[PDB]
């Protein structure tokens, strides 16, 4: 017996293409790429012939296909995208199987409590030169396998490690005054507390809202005030701020301005509840998912492989060209990339050992009650690996790409797949180069590139990173920002209302009675680069303007102050987009004698506003606890366990334990193992085109090899000699 | 009868495809996505059924189809892209008719002299205003057509304007003290009269050279050092600097350094060579055009569009979604993208009159003979338009693109029409926006840019440049470079060589014995923005940390210093990207009270180092005569003669005649016309990846609507 073919294949995710004229469908789905005709007992699969057993049969123009067609076909081994992975890579983040057995390992521990949640549950990095031996020079990897697993025990964090090849615990280990981030329990519990709370329904009810049911929480770390915010360093909590929902599936435009409640999580209990004038909600509906709009018509447009793709997908290592590299996930940081190599006519040269974001955050400029405290710290206090949002085919990547699922541990310790977690495409981008010469026949050659995609959405605001790799040694890295903005409500309607002035001192009146308040986006990449080696310094080339000291008629000329960065406290700076900054190997040179170096760009531009620095005075709490935002740069000596820029637990945090710390004992950067941290951020003063939703805007930051090589890297294999 | 197809279609520069499965021939040119099967009596074009008369013929398994049929097919009004235009822009660009009547025209004159070149033929535009009553109201300009006819009788510039319609000669005016750019035939001449110079080939002899025959010319202009060059300001000249041909199809890789001629392009002789110390020519083969290579077999890829495109081209007048523009070609500085509407739910509003290249500079930084004086004015001293490089199908667009061919004049007055001159293609441009609710359906939208393209080639280096239009409303401009770079020849061969250190004082050492010299980039787009109207301002509004004096734990917080900038002098400054820079209609607001705006944005990011400025002290003289290299951005009230940002004679020019002269009056920038220039730059310290050829670099710009609508642009229409 069959099945209808369009609704089986919709499920199964294939895009299916019918062409009447030719009578063929076109089916699409990652690497695959299939025609296949009515009747056929054959079908084309990446341009080799499948043979079918049953046909598709055309029914009264219904399409219908065997039950085993999705399999036969999208399985068949002429799709050759994905391979087997042999030998295992030890950067393979935990399997299914791994997590629960971490789990069961610390479920069977003494000093192990009911109740206790895991904040992560990873794999602890194997030491990075066993790691670098296996990927080239394929030497197995003889330490054990072992995952850190922390918990949180109500409020109490703990560390633990498991040996999982041994299946034993090695260390437990309570951190004193840490504060673990958010959980997603804690949504519904915060929901739940507001919900229940007699104090907050009467509060709602003054402020004009008659259905307390219709309220929507949302759970916000308080951050660290020493005391000024009246809150007791030791407790669990989180500050909600609240919204009205209308149905219009927006209850981000809805907003109950100053009401704030702060939710003792240990206590279930509201402890505190701050309010300030009562402004009446923004009532009019503003949904952003189309329901109010008229589709509208655009012709088909789609990018196709018909033979497949140019890279393979071996286990999590991808190949592609020149580059090499192993993809990961993390239920923090998001995807890693690891072991990225540059193979150079034979021979494989490091390029970098670990790189993926370092953490973000996005922090308030609004003194009010529902906004002083008011920060995002999207990956460290929320787990953005965890919240990664599918990729949306077609849309939220383009329609050649293939996209991965992934597996991390939730927070009750269970294995869960996240579909289409992370997509990888190549793309053509503009002419690698060209050159035409006059009267002689033009060169020209297509730039390739492959993006690794990835999205986390965080509340109410949604995060887009991509690494691009140029086929030419470049490595890309973006950052997109979309989503809702977090609004604020007023009483003005338009600029030409009393209190418009006061409304908009923190933010633009982007509708009537809503202010976008202004904030900045602030991303920090985490790059343990390792150019052609271990061994590297930070080289500055500053471009200068030096008088003219050879004759002729010119005052001036252009040459270039060039000089090393010795330690971390001089690699913590601001960068300057007209310098060169590099990371260069003094042991290896490329053939003129110059060091083999890679350029490192911070900033290569964006479409909102820059951050030149944290749009914070010195004297905040936010400044002083979060270093990394104020400095573009970052160097610090490579140590496996310092990787975040915010710090390992920086929910209520009191002191730098992230990049302020990493760089404190400004240790020596010379002719060592680096670690280089780009922190790009926005300001973004909002406008009326970016509600109800924001078109996405974009940050980009750069790698570029520098006299890495010798000539022009995308010229090809050369046809003489040796 | 019968013709082959493979042989046929190739010619007409289609596309073909074989699928032996289906038996289908898919056939792609342009804006025509093409479906057909042997023996069938119909194809498809676009997705609509066509019959035809004589089925394709599969012939000794060659097919082969009616002479017909690409008329039939491709021409068969299935194929919408392009459309009739029965009323003519007034902007679209003179005629090859116009042309050869204008030159018609100065010619009967008696003032007229034999061997007189032309250094520009362009339409004399009619006024801004009836120009936009047509676009916005179909009313026809009842001004007659006009061409600017600039002539070069030997080295005086002459400007002479004629009216099409009368036939007749408005106006002869001689240019006092200008000189003419860099004509074609001067190429010529300067390797001719080096060619016959028995001291320059002396010269060279001792340099090494073996064969005088084998010295390739390139001919710069010489700027301007008042009288320190030792050249006279009257005469018509040109610095040549010279390279080796070793048949490696690259003399650019075997400079002959220290050995400049300067030539009298009236007197046709040398009458200056300058000799430095002798440095061996570097003679290493470095072909950049694959003769030595084989590239990796990579799968195909392809960007479709079967059922045509969005956009339709009228003439020169582009529609695509809300946009609608006019896309015109001028000999000088290339594409112009004219009367640029947003269609904002049924009604028009302007955006941009008219937005162009405005001039661009490519200056050195070594002071030694063959460079000091170097700086390579592209599109004012050697015309880009003219140069304009024919698109390579595929590598220099994408696959999906629509190719324009566009037509100019050339320095004798004949109409040269340039094929590819101009790619339009729409492109995936990620997510619009998306919001992903936790627990809730989805919500992405995907983004579409059309992207128009054009690149022009200046001696060894490759022009750039991408006009954007993203469906919601921003304009982005970029510009990228290519090509070879311009090397010193030294004596170092690594780093370790003794003159290693002085030989790269200048510039790295990117191969033996070559540096390529530092210099900047430095592009100047010329943008008539009219937001939402002609009466503008320029408003500033920037970020800053103020003390809380609002109660509660916070000491600081963010807000805005906004204010205006009043004139010429102030709106010509520097750009910080922190900042926000407004070009807004201080007479229409959108719903929440607001003034329509444009946010201005001359430093959206670049991939090669920023020019913060002019690396040039202020005392230099090309700093002196362009002004416009050491500001981003700059704000002037409009006039129909104020196009260059370099001033329209910069050949030898003494000082700003361009935007340092059209901002020194200082006006008043308050409610009126204005025309906003930035300038963007890169300072480009070389490296070995790039050479022998440098992979692409990029820099970015762009014009962001700013409360100019009410909400998301791209959410649609209301049901
Ligand atoms: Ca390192
Ligand atoms: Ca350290
Ligand atoms: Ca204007
Ligand atoms: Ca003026
Ligand atoms: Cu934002
Ligand atoms: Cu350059």
């Not at 990897?141 to 490690?161: F, N, T």
């Not at 308030?364 to 919240?387: E, H, N, Q, R, V």
Request: aromatic share 10%.
């Amino acid at each position: 017996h069959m099945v209808p073919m369009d609704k089986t294949l919709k499920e199964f995710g294939a895009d299916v293409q019918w062409d009447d004229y030719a009578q063929l469908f076109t089916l699409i789905k990652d690497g695959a790429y299939v025609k296949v005709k009515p009747g056929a007992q054959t079908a084309i699969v990446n341009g080799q012939p499948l043979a079918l057993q049953v046909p598709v049969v055309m029914k009264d123009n219904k399409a219908w296909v065997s039950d085993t067609f999705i399999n036969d076909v999208f399985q068949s081994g002429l799709d050759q995208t994905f391979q087997v992975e042999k030998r295992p890579h030890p950067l393979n983040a935990l399997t299914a199987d791994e997590i629960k057995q971490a789990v069961e390992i610390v479920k069977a521990s003494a000093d192990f409590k009911p109740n206790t949640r895991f904040t992560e549950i990873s794999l602890l990095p194997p030491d990075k030169e066993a790691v670098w031996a296996f990927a080239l020079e394929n030497k197995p990897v003889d330490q054990p396998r072992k995952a850190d697993v922390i918990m949180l025990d109500g409020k109490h964090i703990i560390e633990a490690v498991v040996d999982l090849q041994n299946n034993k615990l090695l260390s437990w280990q309570p951190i004193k005054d840490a504060h673990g981030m958010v959980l997603l329990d804690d949504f519904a519990s915060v929901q739940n507390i507001i919900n229940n709370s007699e104090e907050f329904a009467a509060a709602v009810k003054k402020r004009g809202i008659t259905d307390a049911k219709k309220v929507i929480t949302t759970p916000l770390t308080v951050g660290y005030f020493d005391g000024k915010d009246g809150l007791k360093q030791d407790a669990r909590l989180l500050k909600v701020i609240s919204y009205l929902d209308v149905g219009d599936g927006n209850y981000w435009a809805h907003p109950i301005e100053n009401l704030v409640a702060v939710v003792d999580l240990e206590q279930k209990k509201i402890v505190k509840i701050e309010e300030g004038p009562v402004v009446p909600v923004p009532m009019t509906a503003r949904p952003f998912d189309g329901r109010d709009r008229v589709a509208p018509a655009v012709k088909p447009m789609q990018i196709i492989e018909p033979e497949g793709k140019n890279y393979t997908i071996t286990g999590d290592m991808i190949h592609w060209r020149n580059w090499d590299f192993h993809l990961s996930m993390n239920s923090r940081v998001g995807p890693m990339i690891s072991t990225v190599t540059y193979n150079d006519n034979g021979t494989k040269r490091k390029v970098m050992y670990e790189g993926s974001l370092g953490g973000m955050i996005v922090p308030y400029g609004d003194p009010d009650i529902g906004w002083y405290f008011k920060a995002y710290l999207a990956s460290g206090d929320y787990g953005m690996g965890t919240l990664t949002s599918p990729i949306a085919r077609g849309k939220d990547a383009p329609s050649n790409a293939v996209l991965l699922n992934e597996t991390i541990a939730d927070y009750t310790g269970v294995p869960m797949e996240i579909p289409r977690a992370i997509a990888v495409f190549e793309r053509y981008a503009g002419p690698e180069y060209k050159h035409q010469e006059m009267g002689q026949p033009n060169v020209s050659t297509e730039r390739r590139e492959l993006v690794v995609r990835w999205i986390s959405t965080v509340g109410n605001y949604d995060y887009i990173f991509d690494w691009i790799f140029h086929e030419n040694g470049t490595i890309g890295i973006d950052a997109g920002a979309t989503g809702i903005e977090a609004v604020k409500g007023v009483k003005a309607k338009t600029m030409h209302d009393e209190t418009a002035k006061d409304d908009t001192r923190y933010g633009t009146l982007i509708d009537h009675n809503i202010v976008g308040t202004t904030h900045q986006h602030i991303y920090n990449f985490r790059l343990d680069l390792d150019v052609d080696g271990e061994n590297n310094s930070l080289v500055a080339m500053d471009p200068v303007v030096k008088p003219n000291t050879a004759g002729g008629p010119r005052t001036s000329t252009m040459q270039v102050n060039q000089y090393n960065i010795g330690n971390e406290q001089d690699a913590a700076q601001k960068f300057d987009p007209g310098t060169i900054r590099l990371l260069s190997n003094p042991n290896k040179e490329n053939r003129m004698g110059n060091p083999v170096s890679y350029q490192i760009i911070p900033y290569a531009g964006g479409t909102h506003p820059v951050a030149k620095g944290a749009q914070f005075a010195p004297d905040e709490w936010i400044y002083h606890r979060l270093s990394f935002m104020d400095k573009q740069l970052w160097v610090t000596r490579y140590h496996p366990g310092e990787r975040f820029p915010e710090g390992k637990y920086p929910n209520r945090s009191t002191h730098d334990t992230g990049l302020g710390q990493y760089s404190k004992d400004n240790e020596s950067l010379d002719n060592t193992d680096a670690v280089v941290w780009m922190t790009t951020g926005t300001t973004h003063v909002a406008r009326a085109e970016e509600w109800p939703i924001m078109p996405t805007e974009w940050v980009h930051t750069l790698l570029k090899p520098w006299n890495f090589f010798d000539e022009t890297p995308t010229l090809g294999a050369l046809k003489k000699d040796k």
